[PDB]
Design a protein around this nucleic acid. Structure first.
Lengths: 208, 100, 62, 99, 84
RNA sequence: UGGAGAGUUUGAUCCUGGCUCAGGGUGAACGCUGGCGGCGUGCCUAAGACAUGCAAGUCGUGCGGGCCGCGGGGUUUUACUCCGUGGUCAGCGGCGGACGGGUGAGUAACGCGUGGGUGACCUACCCGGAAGAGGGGGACAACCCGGGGAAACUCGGGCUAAUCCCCCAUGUGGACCCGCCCCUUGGGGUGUGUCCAAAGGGCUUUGCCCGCUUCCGGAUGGGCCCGCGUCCCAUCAGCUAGUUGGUGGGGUAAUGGCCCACCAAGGCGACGACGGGUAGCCGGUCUGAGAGGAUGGCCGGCCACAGGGGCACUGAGACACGGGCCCCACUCCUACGGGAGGCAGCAGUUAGGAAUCUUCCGCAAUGGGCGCAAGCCUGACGGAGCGACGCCGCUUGGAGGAAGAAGCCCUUCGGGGUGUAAACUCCUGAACCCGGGACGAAACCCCCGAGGAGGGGACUGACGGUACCGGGGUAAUAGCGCCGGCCAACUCCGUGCCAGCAGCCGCGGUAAUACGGAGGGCGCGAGCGUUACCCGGAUUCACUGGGCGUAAAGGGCGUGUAGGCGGCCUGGGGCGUCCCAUGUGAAA
């Protein structure tokens, strides 16, 4: 099962936040600004010299950790990444981002990973005619993420869309707060979504 | 079709039938260099006409007898006393390798 | 056949599961024993190597 | 217990019967033919080679000798007569015999 | 004896038969002389049918025999039709 | 578009180098934990032996009959029989049993992958083509009479039919024989002489359907043959008298000694013969940048085996898994005179091993065998069940939430940690309740036309009311390796060369970051470690890609055979080689 629970324990773990949880872990701490640094009794007891390969492992985590998916499937779609054609690193990134759940999140329907993937597995997302649970279902150019009909009358969905209006969507993310939708336009790149993560480190690591 | 090959007549010593030292060569499926190889065949001579050396183009035909495969349809050269010599030098070497 | 260390009974049958792996001890140590098998079931109270050392799930009922 | 593979061996016993009798007659007629021809009379053994020919057809038609086989028997049988006719005899009459 | 038949491939609950000529002996999901068509009675793809009626006319004109699902296929692919 | 290294030899460096690890996989196994669902996979051992249930049947459009049934015909009526007759049981007769099917024992193989020769060949159930289907005869069942026996079944006698067996035929044609024209391995024609046919059944009958006879052509599978590649030990060096070859015979569909006879000495071998250990082979598969190494189970092709061996028979096809004969064991039934049986078919028992499952449903779909069809057998096939054995997707929750409660770990008594984690909050809503509800299957079939093409209507679900659609709604499993460097992560007590961990180096010999406990954190998470087997790192059998002054290694030195390779130049060859056309390389 996808870890869950004490989450932004992960945030402090990297030493750099990952929103992970919205409203709070986005507010004055992702467990950060309160006491930001890797957890445990140790933690704030003088950092070391973590080897290149090791901070690289950390980077691989880091990346899989912001993408609320098991390192199992992080790896899986990495194998698929090295499989077909595409700029290995940046394309691997876009391949991770092109997943239904964070599509729904970055659309602003949800306020972070946990909530996002939850709602998505709850099949509240009608893409091109059908509601799809299936969190690790990647969309295609010309498709559009929608929400169900009774789901138009949902509390924090309405609240999300309320506080969302004004917050300009991603470039490949087409907003549609009128028709209750989100056009999955082009296929984004590193300069569309920037997260404290190196692509070639994940390559070099996984591609041993 | 019907695979053929030229070949140096060895041993006329059988009646109306001679043996033929046929030859080939090919590289090495993992070691470059071309290697030379021997492989004897049955030269079929209903009207005894081939002798010590006579390189002839020889023909795989209908099963003639016990291993009696191949035949002849045309000659090329005669008096290959040098080649047959080398053949017999090899045979000398065979009669020069005792374990008893 | 060696054993998985501390906490044995074994007497003389057990079905010691011939395993495999020497060390700088007993000029052999090849083909170990396992606990759980048909005998031993690990250390009387173990909190880690319960993958050989028998003990199931320390269900301390609290 | 029950399986009509008994049908097999029954009818097959009958078929073996067929083969036995007919094929046997074939062999023997061939032999009388070569006997008479070896002597130096022919004519009777050529009417017996006639009867023989018909018989080897009886072989060909059935499951005894199959087509080409019966043909081969015919051939060899007819062949041996001719040469061993000339041998001290004189081939006068002809049936399966060609001039 | 050479007959035209069907060889289903795929998985467990996603049928799709290969419309294919072969000889009598050849087992089902086995070997074939030549393949000419496809048919999936499931109907999930508009391409649920294809018949290479050319080589079909070959086989029919050169001494072979059909099947039953074939009968349907032949009467539904102009394999039978003689125009006029 | 494809290449990461590291520890360990010293006081210290460097080099050669061995060991070990990080890694990837598997038909797995083992322990620890274990929720949902999809597609796969599942005796890897004893080719050890098996209870029982099923797996090869089908046909009245070949034929006679038993006998159950019915209108009931005949007999004036009678005993009862007897015409039509659904049936129903076998028989004679006809087609599959040589496919479907499993294992891997043998087999180092013209077996297999592979490219062709067959002027050395076979091919039924099928599409075309041609000549057709005159007449007669005999015999055995099933049945009726008697016997043996526990059965198995076995013996004799007496009859009827036939698409059962023959007989002179009719003879486009096919077969041989001796010649002859063309060829060129036995390819095709042709002059003489002899042999062969046929089965008929149905009915809307004067015509057709189903089958039959004689040949030719294809469709299709195989037979034989060569070319070619094909594990290891040289401490396996010589092997062979059916042996090498022929003539002449015998046999097969047929080439050939495969076998008879007679005969001339040859036939293979360091290009590894002979021997023996080992082994099914492949399209493929895992790993490595690649060269390659290893591998061949599910699947698809070729082989081989039927408890071991011999062996024929039947036939289009076999030396035939659920046909026959015999020897060998081996087990079982009996009244101990006698007799039976083969789960390397399919479920299931047992021996075996660390380990490899249900004694299930339906011929609805496809496919095979048979029948004019209706239809029938099908443990082929098509479906559920069981096992985290493999891969895939997936819930245990979201969101507010403390200078952060307490519970427990740590302390320099200030606190630090655990952890927004918890609790309190609202939100949704697995599991689960009601309702409806599938695709998988439209052909076959009767009907108009002609039985053709075409047209119409109607029958046909094992899964299962499962999938899925709609609504009602519960927060609703968490583990496994580790924290001494390779390898990411330390603090506290105990234990004191003891108990012990360890793949490598090693670590503890009374303040252990390696044992063992407890908090925390590294990894992974419906899974994790362990071992085993395989490829890599191993460039550590080096072709890419190594070496022999002292680390492992020049043969004590000259000789010479074969073999290996080779100076300048002209031209011919076009073998190696290079180029494009092109056949095949199936499918997956």
């Amino acid at each position: 099962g996808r870890y869950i629970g004490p989450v932004c324990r992960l945030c402090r773990r990297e030493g750099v936040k990952l929103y992970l949880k919205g409203e709070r872990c986005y507010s004055p701490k992702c467990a950060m600004e309160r006491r930001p640094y890797p957890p445990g009794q140790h933690g704030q007891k003088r950092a070391r010299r973590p080897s290149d390969y090791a901070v690289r492992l950390r980077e691989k985590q880091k990346l899989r950790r912001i993408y609320g998916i098991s390192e199992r499937q992080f790896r899986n779609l990495f194998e698929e990444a090295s499989k077909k054609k595409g700029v290995t690193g940046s394309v691997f990134l876009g391949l991770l981002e092109s997943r239904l759940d964070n599509v729904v999140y970055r659309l602003g329907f949800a306020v972070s990973r946990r909530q996002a993937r939850q709602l998505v597995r709850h099949g509240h997302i009608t893409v091109n005619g059908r509601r799809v649970d299936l969190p690790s279902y990647r969309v295609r150019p010309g498709d559009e993420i929608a929400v169900a009909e009774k789901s138009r009358n949902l509390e924090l969905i309405r609240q999300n869309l309320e506080a969302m209006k004004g917050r300009k969507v991603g470039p490949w993310l087409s907003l549609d707060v009128e028709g209750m939708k989100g056009k999955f336009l082009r296929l984004p790149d590193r300069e569309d979504l920037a997260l404290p993560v190196n692509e070639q480190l994940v390559i070099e690591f996984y591609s041993r | 079709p019907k695979k053929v090959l030229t070949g140096v007549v060895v041993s006329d010593k059988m009646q109306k039938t001679v043996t033929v030292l046929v030859e080939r060569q090919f590289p090495h499926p993992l070691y470059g260099k071309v290697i030379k190889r021997s492989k004897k065949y049955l030269a079929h001579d209903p009207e005894e006409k081939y002798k010590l050396g006579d390189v002839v183009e020889i023909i795989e035909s209908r099963p003639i007898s016990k291993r009696k495969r191949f035949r002849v349809l045309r000659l090329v050269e005669s008096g290959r006393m040098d080649l047959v010599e080398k053949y017999l030098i090899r045979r000398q070497n065979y009669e020069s390798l005792s374990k008893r | 056949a060696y054993i998985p260390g501390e906490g044995h009974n074994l007497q003389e049958h057990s079905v010691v599961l011939i395993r495999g792996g020497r060390v700088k001890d007993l000029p052999g140590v090849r083909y170990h024993i396992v606990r759980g098998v048909y005998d031993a079931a690990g250390v009387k109270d173990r909190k880690k190597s319960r993958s050989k050392y028998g003990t199931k799930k320390p269900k301390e009922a609290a | 217990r029950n399986l009509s593979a008994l049908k097999r061996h029954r009818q097959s016993l009958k078929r073996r019967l067929r083969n036995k009798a007919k094929k046997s007659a074939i062999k023997t007629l061939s032999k009388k033919a070569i006997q008479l021809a070896q002597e130096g009379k022919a004519e009777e053994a050529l009417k017996i080679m006639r009867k023989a020919e018909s018989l080897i057809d009886k072989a060909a038609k059935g499951s005894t000798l199959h087509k080409n086989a019966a043909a081969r028997r015919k051939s060899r049988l007819m062949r041996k007569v001719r040469q061993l006719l000339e041998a001290a005899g004189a081939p006068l009459i002809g049936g399966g015999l060609s001039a | 004896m050479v007959k035209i038949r069907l060889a289903r491939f795929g998985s467990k609950h996603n049928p799709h038969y290969r419309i294919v000529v072969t000889d009598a002996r050849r087992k089902r999901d086995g070997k074939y002389i030549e393949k000419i068509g496809y048919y999936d009675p499931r109907k999930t793809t508009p391409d649920w049918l294809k018949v290479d009626v050319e080589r079909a006319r070959y086989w029919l004109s050169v001494g072979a025999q059909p099947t039953d699902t074939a009968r349907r296929l032949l009467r539904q692919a102009g394999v039978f039709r003689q125009e006029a």
